[PDB]
């Protein structure tokens, strides 16, 4: 989130230790609020997993464990198991926007297979989309694991946020995973400009393909 | 056991309103404070607000976002906690989760980690109603090859509601295809992909025809994807 930030995943492989850090600023964990650790498993509502900074409800293992220094906290696993697969938000109350604050949410995956670098195919707009006075940009990723992206796009190498939808990842027929993310344009944005690209980060690594207005067309 | 139940969830048109309510059972409802979150599709946690107890006047407070706009109330002889929801954004769509605060008492004072949640209810907030899609092929080219592989697909766009299925070659052609998810635009309409792995060589010598099938608005669509010479 804005006001308290999580890495958007962490892996590692049974019986391994990891950690997930919560680094937040001086409106809130820095001030003195208690952190607090949200487990997610897939398909399921929240629970909650650690409260004051370090304290287990019944039912969770000592496994967990969370610390807090400074505008920093973190949650340990330590002894990964098969069902710790889940997201994990830290959550603080902060002072400048006088609410609970949510960090982002971090995905864990308890490592079942070889880690795999993504694939990437970018697709420009159909002519028939065109012609129907309509643009999208259309990023495929396949073949990676962890199951764990974010997708960037560029216009002539300049960042570009606004009509960017992207899917979590899914599993593809051979266990790997995949994901897409679309670029809605106008077909005059389109044409306008030279080039058009899709980064994908995967594993602190980024794969990044380009497509040009002027071909193809 | 401790137990929550959301219920009132449902499609509603922007500015209007909408209540939830939440059934508390399983222990004394009127000894805690109650807190909402919601989470939008495929978004993070987002708190939405909380009640006190009635003994201190049952005083709320919000996130920024639903100020003047969300109402909690509840009414402890029912057990139940409500969230009015009026002014109604398409960005309050979202699945709504109503939660208990804890009671366990730290140094010196009390936490508040919310210690026993509900289910979820999602409220969807749009102006979309049943809806075919329009599918546009993914042509392979050489941009789309790879070692002799070339990919090719087809975009389903802008249909309403949830689900469209896939197949290709009317389901003679499996190996290597993928259909995505869908994603939720903003318009309250869905789009998804397929994609499917072919020998470039086989380009000018197969046929790849996509299969869309929208049972919502009793549509099929055949589309042909034909290969691009650049
Ligand atoms: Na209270």
């Known amino acids: 989130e804005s006001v308290l930030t999580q890495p958007p995943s962490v892996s590692g492989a049974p019986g391994q230790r990891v950690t997930i850090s919560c680094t937040g600023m001086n409106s809130n964990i820095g001030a003195g609020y208690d952190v607090y650790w949200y487990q997610q498993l897939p398909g399921r509502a929240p629970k909650l997993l650690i409260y004051g900074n370090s304290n287990r409800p019944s039912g969770v293992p000592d496994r967990f464990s969370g610390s807090r220094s400074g505008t920093s906290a973190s949650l340990a696993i330590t002894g990964l198991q098969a069902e710790d697969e889940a997201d994990y938000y830290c959550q603080s109350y902060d002072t400048s926007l006088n609410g609970w604050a949510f960090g982002g949410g971090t995905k864990l995956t308890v490592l079942t297979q070889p880690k795999a670098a993504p694939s990437v195919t970018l697709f420009p707009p159909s002519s028939e989309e065109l012609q129907a006075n309509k643009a999208t940009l259309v990023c495929l990723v396949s073949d990676f694991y962890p199951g764990a992206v974010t997708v960037a796009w560029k216009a002539d190498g300049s960042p570009v946020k606004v009509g960017v939808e992207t899917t979590k990842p899914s599993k593809q027929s051979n266990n790997k995973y995949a994901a897409s993310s679309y670029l809605s344009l106008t077909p005059e944005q389109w044409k306008s400009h030279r080039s058009y690209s899709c980064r994908v980060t995967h594993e602190g690594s980024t794969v990044e393909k380009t497509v040009a207005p002027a071909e193809c067309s | 056991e401790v137990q929550l139940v959301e219920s009132g969830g449902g499609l509603v048109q922007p500015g209007r309103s909408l209540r939830l309510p939440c059934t508390a059972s399983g222990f004394s409802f009127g000894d805690h404070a109650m807190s909402w979150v919601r989470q939008a599709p495929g978004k993070g946690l987002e708190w939405v607000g909380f009640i006190r107890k009635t003994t201190y006047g049952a005083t709320t407070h919000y996130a920024a976002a639903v100020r003047g706009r969300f109402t909690i109330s509840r009414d402890d002889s029912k057990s139940i906690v409500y969230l009015q929801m009026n002014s109604l954004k398409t960005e309050d769509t979202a699945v709504y989760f109503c939660?208990?605060?804890?009671?366990?008492?730290?140094?010196?004072?009390?936490?508040?980690?919310?210690?026993?949640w509900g289910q979820g209810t999602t409220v969807t907030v749009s102006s979309a109603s049943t809806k075919g899609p329009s599918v546009f092929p993914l042509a392979p080219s050489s941009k789309s090859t790879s070692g002799g592989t070339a990919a090719l697909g087809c975009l389903v766009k802008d249909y309403f509601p949830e689900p469209v299925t896939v197949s290709w070659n009317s389901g003679a052609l499996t190996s290597g295809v993928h259909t995505f998810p869908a994603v939720l635009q903003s318009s309250g309409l869905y789009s998804l992909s397929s994609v499917v792995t072919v020998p470039s060589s086989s380009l000018g010598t197969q046929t790849y025809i996509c299969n869309v099938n929208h049972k919502p608005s009793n549509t099929k669509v055949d589309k042909k994807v034909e290969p691009k010479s650049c």
């Open positions: 939660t208990r605060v804890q009671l366990d008492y730290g140094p010196g004072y009390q936490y508040y980690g919310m210690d026993v």
